[PDB]
């Protein structure tokens, strides 16, 4: 089965289902299984995953904001190393972002 | 452990500010230089423990606007969500 972690796939996998797929697993989940950023080792402790799913604080304000709302980002393109500047975020009533500029710019993409 | 210094009344602006937090944490090329970005390398990609020498903080705000106190706050609320920096305010 395909390992999802493109904008497209993703996106739509977030809308389609509500959730991230399985190969999604978040920051202080990896670091329970041995996740060492400086290390560059995810794939090593947590083959075929990618870290994604954490709570998204938006903290230049760039995506829009709405009472009840709340955001989450993950990675994409990832598959092994050094982390990437790829992101998608999604929030609590399902709008989704991308960032390929590691959060410098945003693109409506849902 | 990591130490970064930043020498408060070296800042000139929010850029030097932010390329100094580059070379102090040796973050990746693509670093963003915003609040997020910096968040995102405490939280997957600097090297702990980190020891962080903030020298000369008020300097420091004078010519970033409020770009030294979310920079300070950003990384005081990693350290509360368990990361291991130990930050010294001079």
Known sequence: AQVI?????????????????????????????????????????????????DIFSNREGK??????????????????????????????????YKTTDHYQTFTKIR | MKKAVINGEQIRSISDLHQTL???????????????????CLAGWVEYPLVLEWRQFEQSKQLTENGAESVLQVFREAKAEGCDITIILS
């Open chain 2, 22 to 40: 580059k070379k102090e944490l040796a973050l990746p090329e693509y670093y963003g230089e915003n609040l997020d970005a910096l968040w995102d």
């Open chain 1, 63 to 96: 995506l829009p904001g709405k009472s009840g709302r709340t955001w989450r980002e993950a990675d994409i393109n990832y598959t092994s190393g050094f982390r990437n500047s790829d992101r998608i975020l999604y929030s609590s009533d399902w709008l989704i």
């Open chain 1, 5 to 53: 972690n493109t904008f497209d796939g993703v996106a739509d996998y977030l809308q389609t289902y509500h959730k991230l797929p399985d190969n999604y697993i978040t920051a202080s989940e990896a670091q329970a299984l041995g996740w060492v950023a400086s290390k560059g080792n995810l794939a090593d402790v947590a083959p075929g995953k990618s870290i994604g799913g």
